[PDB]
Symmetry: C2
Subunit: 215 residues, 2 copies
């Protein structure tokens, strides 16, 4: 089953600005998504203190970044609290309304795009380097769903019947723009992660496939 909903106006407006902005420091997108992942892990960590059984679906708390060159895709995974179908819709398509409107207002007044996280809508910074995104989430309270959007004013939510089933958490599958493929490179990804992830209290794993070279 697949359902389509429309973003609140202000969210669609910010996604348009961001997906076409010229900004010269797009690497900030990773810092924002790592921050959100850290937040999602904290939520499950907290909940598990009194409800340890909640971790059993996925015992390990981590953030995993997996570049997928063949598909020009970059996946940012966390074993956080995840999102139910209802949460994906609300959290990503509606509740950010006032944040994106305030941020849009700040940008017009001259603020730098890097301030996005300060307005709680850092999530949309992904469109700085991707023209499409699939958010695959598995919450202990629901089935695995796929939320998708190419910044067209609307988004769809589909019961996951194609992706690998995860124990618990969220995956942000970024379909990178053709001129932003540097973010598939281990070296570049590494440099960006180390630049702002000192605070992160969970392991940040990088999954890379490399053909054994030589001396």
């Amino acid at each position: 089953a697949s359902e389509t909903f429309e973003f609140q106006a202000e969210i669609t407006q910010l996604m348009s600005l961001i997906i076409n902005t010229v900004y010269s420091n797009k690497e900030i997108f990773l810092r924002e998504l790592i921050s959100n992942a850290s937040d999602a892990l904290d939520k499950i960590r907290y909940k598990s203190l009194s409800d340890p059984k909640q971790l059993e679906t996925e015992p390990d708390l981590f953030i995993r970044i997996t570049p997928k060159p063949e598909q020009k895709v970059l996946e940012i995974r966390d074993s956080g609290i995840g999102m139910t179908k209802a949460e994906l819709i609300n959290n990503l398509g509606t509740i950010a309304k006032s944040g994106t409107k305030a941020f849009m207002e700040a940008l017009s007044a001259g603020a730098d795009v890097s301030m996005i996280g300060q307005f709680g809508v850092g999530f949309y910074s992904l469109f700085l380097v991707a023209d499409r995104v699939q958010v695959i989430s598995k919450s202990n309270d629901d089935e695995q769903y796929i939320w998708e959007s190419n910044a067209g004013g609307s988004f769809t939510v589909t019961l996951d019947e194609v992706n690998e089933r995860i124990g618990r958490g969220t995956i942000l599958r970024l379909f990178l723009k053709d001129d932003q493929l540097e973010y598939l490179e281990e070296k570049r990804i590494k440099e960006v992660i180390k630049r702002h992830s000192e605070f992160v209290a969970y392991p940040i794993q990088l999954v890379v496939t490399k053909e054994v070279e030589k001396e």
Copy 2:
């Protein structure tokens, strides 16, 4: 474990010998497994010469090594010809009989464990570093199956319904001994490959998961 079979007696003898031996240069197990992977690839390649359709289930010919530290597992994958249920049974539990018997006689006469490949049974050297092995295979001619062994005299063959489906090929999922975990490390696997399998005619991909270290420890 849909079906259970018995290895020819001699194969079981060799497996017990290998899983127990104190041989030091255990790293030779990888060269033998990569060599078997290469041979399997040479097989569909040759077959695809007149029947290119055979490659379509998996167009790329490669070897892939994936250490899974959490499971203390090391997987050796190839997109070779693969093995049907019947071939897994025969190839791994029966036809190695003569080879294992001659090798054991050779070891008694002073042969080195590293010469195992010369008797065509290098596959069993996996027991130098592993306690158990699961051979997950998919031939174009059969469904995906799992052959499992722990060096004991019996092995099982199970229709695969738990693992990820592969296009074509074989995965040697090795459950490493507690004292052989070094083979889960990228640096170590790379040096063993450069030392003994640096001229394999197929790309050897290493899938590694590395924790990004902190800018400044703590």
